[PDB]
Amino acid sequence: RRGDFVRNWQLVAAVPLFQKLGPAVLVEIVRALRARTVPAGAVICRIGEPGDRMFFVVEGSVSVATPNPVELGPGAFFGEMALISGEPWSATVSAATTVSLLSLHSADFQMLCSSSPEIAEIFRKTALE
Amino acid sequence: GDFVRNWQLVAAVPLFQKLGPAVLVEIVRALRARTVPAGAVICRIGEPGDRMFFVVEGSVSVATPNPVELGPGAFFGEMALISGEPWSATVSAATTVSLLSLHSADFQMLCSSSPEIAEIFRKTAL
Amino acid sequence: RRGDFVRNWQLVAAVPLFQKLGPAVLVEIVRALRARTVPAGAVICRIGEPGDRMFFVVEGSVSVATPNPVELGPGAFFGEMALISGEPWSATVSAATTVSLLSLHSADFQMLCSSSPEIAEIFRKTAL
């Protein structure tokens, strides 16, 4: 489906970290994404484990193991500091129902610094942080 | 213009799955639109819930571990729509966010026109 | 498909005669629509034949038999006038490709006067 690409763009464009990134850039961000079906109950990211990627919950809902547990349905995303630095996950997130995941690996978003200055400026901005 | 955009957003919600076109068009008409600046608290922990929210533009943030954010096409507060339970997490705007909300009262008042809405309440009540 | 309903609503909502209609009224009109698939070359409406229905071209393009052979793609509609009066077609429109048709018959539209005040207001403003 071609409409899936659009809705993925729509999700990607909505990321605060990506606000000053133009259309051309966003496309290649979307093209880099990796699709993964996750069964109900299965872990997506462990607490305290090395975050090397960002996640996008296209269809289905996810459970969040926190001081206050919350099930968050479709159109959800997390892991911005896993892209930029090597921040470990502050909470275990798992699939509440059948989950349709899209994943941005920190390697691919990084390999975009050569062609995109706006992305390059994200990492440099993380000098004092 | 916005109506069709709102129809499809609402029609994506599983709670509204078994609903019909005539019922759905009335729900869209009941929606309220609001644009919130980045940082402003939308709904707060512990406070009672009286509406359901839809993200149209931008993305909101859930304050638990500040991990999960919700972008366009996302929704929250299904149970605060039917029953009236307080929110399990504080939600606020990460960016400038365009939102729709369906007030619980306006949804409850559609039992008059929809056996399906009434059934949702009959099961939820018991 | 529920997806097709919203596309049909959107086209109906764009009809000049239908502008002063609320979202709920447009639902009854879309519910009244009749679907047909018509092969390329077939006549949708023939000049001089009585106009008893309005047409919506959901998929495919249509050709108008004007001295200039024009092809007008999907999202096309005509025969708005055929709901008001019995006036015959001024031209012949035919399918230029495979066409998915939607049809609102003048009779089905007419008896929505008892259902909804705005349609009844359309007939009053006409006859006045």
Next chain:
Amino acid sequence: RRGDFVRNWQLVAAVPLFQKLGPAVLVEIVRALRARTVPAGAVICRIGEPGDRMFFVVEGSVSVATPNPVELGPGAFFGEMALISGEPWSATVSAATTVSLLSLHSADFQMLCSSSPEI
């Protein structure tokens, strides 16, 4: 607003002329598009004039000057031969209601078939 952009993308991709084109290029087309809203009654393009651009209907309806006028609604497009070539508009098109439109100028379209010759 990324709202209009997404709407414009899905709109142009539904048009057959752009079907066999990749996500990378459809975007550049969309950026090259210009938006205008026209009042009911106003002439968008005249018969016999110079065919400069292609048109996409967003909201409202335009009308084509046929004996019993044919209207084009949201998702409709017109003026294709004004890109593949540059010939007189074969019929006069005006606004039936208040119409929101997208337009692609033959300048930009040609200036984008060099980057990706797919047409």
